[PDB]
From Swiss-Prot, chain A:
Acts as a regulatory subunit of the 26S proteasome which is involved in the ATP-dependent degradation of ubiquitinated proteins. The keyword Phosphoprotein applies. GO terms for cellular component: proteasome complex; proteasome regulatory particle, lid subcomplex; proteasome storage granule. N-acetylated by NAT1. The chain holds residues 1 to 177 of 338 of the full protein. This is 26S proteasome regulatory subunit RPN8. The keyword Phosphoprotein applies. Keywords: Acetylation, Phosphoprotein, Proteasome. Present with 19800 molecules/cell in log phase SD medium. The gene is RPN8. It comes from Saccharomyces cerevisiae (strain ATCC 204508 / S288c). The lineage of its organism: Eukaryota, Fungi, Dikarya, Ascomycota, Saccharomycotina. GO terms for biological process: proteasome-mediated ubiquitin-dependent protein catabolic process; ubiquitin-dependent protein catabolic process.
From Swiss-Prot, chain B:
There is a cross-link at K6, K11, K27, K29, K33, K48, K63 (Glycyl lysine isopeptide (Lys-Gly) (interchain with G-Cter in ubiquitin)). It is found in: Cytoplasm; Nucleus. There is a cross-link at G76 (Glycyl lysine isopeptide (Gly-Lys) (interchain with K-? in acceptor proteins)). It comes from Saccharomyces cerevisiae (strain ATCC 204508 / S288c). Changing K63R: Deficiency in ubiquitin-protein conjugate formation. Loss of DNA repair function. Exists either covalently attached to another protein, or free (unanchored). When covalently bound, it is conjugated to target proteins via an isopeptide bond either as a monomer (monoubiquitin), a polymer linked via different Lys residues of the ubiquitin (polyubiquitin chains) or a linear polymer linked via the initiator Met of the ubiquitin (linear polyubiquitin chains). Changing K48R: Deficiency in ubiquitin-protein conjugate formation. Residues 1-76 form the Ubiquitin-like domain. This is Ubiquitin.
From Swiss-Prot, chain C:
The chain holds residues 24 to 217 of 306 of the full protein. GO terms for biological process: mitochondrial fission; peroxisome fission; proteasome assembly; proteasome storage granule assembly; proteasome-mediated ubiquitin-dependent protein catabolic process; protein deubiquitination. A motif (JAMM motif) lies at residues 86-99. Keywords: Acetylation, Hydrolase, Metal-binding, Metalloprotease, Protease, Proteasome, Thiol protease, Ubl conjugation pathway, Zinc. GO terms for cellular component: cytosol; mitochondrion; nucleus; proteasome complex; proteasome regulatory particle, lid subcomplex; proteasome storage granule. This is Ubiquitin carboxyl-terminal hydrolase RPN11. N-acetylated by NAT3. The gene is RPN11. The JAMM motif is required for the deubiquitination and degradation of ubiquitinated substrates. Component of the lid subcomplex of the 26S proteasome, a multiprotein complex involved in the ATP-dependent degradation of ubiquitinated proteins. RPN11 is the only catalytically active member of the lid and serves as the essential deubiquitinase of the proteasome. Belongs to the peptidase M67A family. Present with 16400 molecules/cell in log phase SD medium. It is an enzyme of class 3 (hydrolase). Residues 4-136 form the MPN domain.
Length: 177, 76, 159
């Protein structure tokens, strides 16, 4: 009756990983970093638990123009597979702050690597505002009330930060002062 | 001929060898300049772990080539 | 007065890996930089294919360690290995005989190398059981501390 994916939880480590990626590539405020997210996307709730950075470059001025290293995705994910088979490739992330005209085309690229409709996680690394610096999206193709035409579009999913016991210990430790 | 052996810690080591050298003896040639037992050395080149039995001619390692040293990682 | 500074991702990666391996030991490499004579920064860590029991662990794939270090350079992590970490599920932090044989091989390539040991079992809310060590063979313990505004606001989003 209803879509399967209704909710998303993100591990703290994922958020800190996106932030470390953006910092270490010294991404200029106009620029953004892009990577992969891993986890479990079979239950209603999508669990984002790990991630890794991608080589990614784009034209500051135009949207259609970008490079995403196909070979790196394949290489790094197989590495991850050896270390942890539970964390499967479920989508991608970028540093935002918001959706960009190129994200639907970039998302189609990840459909090759995910067993399900990919999940796009934006992590607003500059953390402006109250409320989580995360927004989750899955692309769907909706039949516009034409009623035969369609319109490929990002569907928003609400987010929460959920930590395992180990991450909860680490975070409360880090938040010591 | 002069080759290079970079480590994952940044320190780089330079060796002078000849293409008629077994991987077993190359690890011994590393223990002389830094003190690491050969049994604890894993040699990598072009994605391949060098096997102690073969020589440089089996891996086509020419002059000024760069090897990468990984260590045996053992914890208890 | 020398201190090992462990970044947020490094601590969370090591804790998460320690608890997942239970009841086995786990290990991995530590990336960072030696800023000065009194300061070691561990910015990042990673785990290679390995095998462990309740009281041992060893790395299996050695290609993986080389490869991984090139992937990170490609994505902005230029830091190199400053040491290694493994877990003592349930029996505290200290260096065993095996760990010394491994640590000295590390200290041969960098006299400032570090060996970190975490106890996933004894680590609980309000008590993180971790320690950093080096040799001279006996060994000694280095003080551990943690470094940013960006990470801190981000962490406060949990709860
Ligand atoms: Zn130990």
């Amino acid at each position: 009756m209803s879509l399967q994916h209704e909710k998303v939880t993100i591990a703290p480590l994922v958020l800190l990983s996106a932030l470390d990626h953006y910092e270490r590539t010294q991404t200029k405020e106009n620029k953004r970093c892009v990577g992969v997210i891993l986890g479990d996307a079979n239950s209603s709730t999508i669990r984002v638990t790990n991630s890794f950075a991608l080589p990614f470059e784009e034209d500051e001025k135009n949207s259609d123009v970008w490079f995403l290293d196909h070979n790196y995705i394949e290489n790094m994910n197989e590495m991850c597979k050896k270390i942890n088979a539970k964390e499967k490739l479920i989508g991608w992330y970028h540093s935002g702050p918001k959706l960009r005209a190129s994200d639907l085309k970039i998302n189609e690229l990840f459909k090759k690597y995910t067993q399900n409709n990919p999940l796009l996680l934006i992590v607003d690394v500059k953390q402006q505002g109250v409320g989580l610096p995360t927004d989750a999206y899955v692309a769907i193709e909706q039949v516009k009330d034409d009623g035969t035409s369609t319109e490929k579009t990002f569907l928003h999913l609400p987010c929460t930060i959920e930590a395992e016991e180990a991450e909860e210990i680490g975070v409360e430790h880090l938040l010591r002062d | 001929m002069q080759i290079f052996v970079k480590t994952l810690t940044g320190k780089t080591i330079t060796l002078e060898v000849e293409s008629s050298d077994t991987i077993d003896n190359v690890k011994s040639k590393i223990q002389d300049k830094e003190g690491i037992p050969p049994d604890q050395q894993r040699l990598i080149f072009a994605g391949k772990q060098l096997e102690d039995g073969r020589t440089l001619s089996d891996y086509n390692i020419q002059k000024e080539s760069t090897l990468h040293l990984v260590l045996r990682l053992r914890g208890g | 007065k020398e201190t090992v500074y462990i970044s947020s991702i490094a601590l969370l990666k090591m804790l998460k890996h320690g608890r997942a391996g239970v009841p086995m030991e786990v290990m991995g490499l530590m990336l960072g930089e030696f800023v000065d004579d009194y300061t070691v920064n561990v910015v990042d860590v990673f785990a290679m294919p390995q095998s462990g029991t309740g009281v041992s662990v060893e790395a299996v794939d050695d290609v993986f360690q080389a490869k991984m270090m090139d992937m990170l350079k490609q994505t902005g992590r230029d830091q190199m290995v400053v040491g290694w970490y493994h877990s003592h599920p349930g029996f505290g932090c200290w260096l065993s005989s095996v760990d010394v044989n491994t640590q000295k091989s590390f200290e041969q390539l960098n006299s400032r190398a570090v060996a970190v040991v975490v106890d996933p079992i004894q680590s609980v809310k309000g008590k993180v059981v971790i320690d950093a060590f080096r040799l001279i063979r006996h060994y000694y313990s280095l003080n551990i501390d943690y470094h940013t505004a960006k990470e801190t606001k981000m962490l406060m989003n949990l709860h």
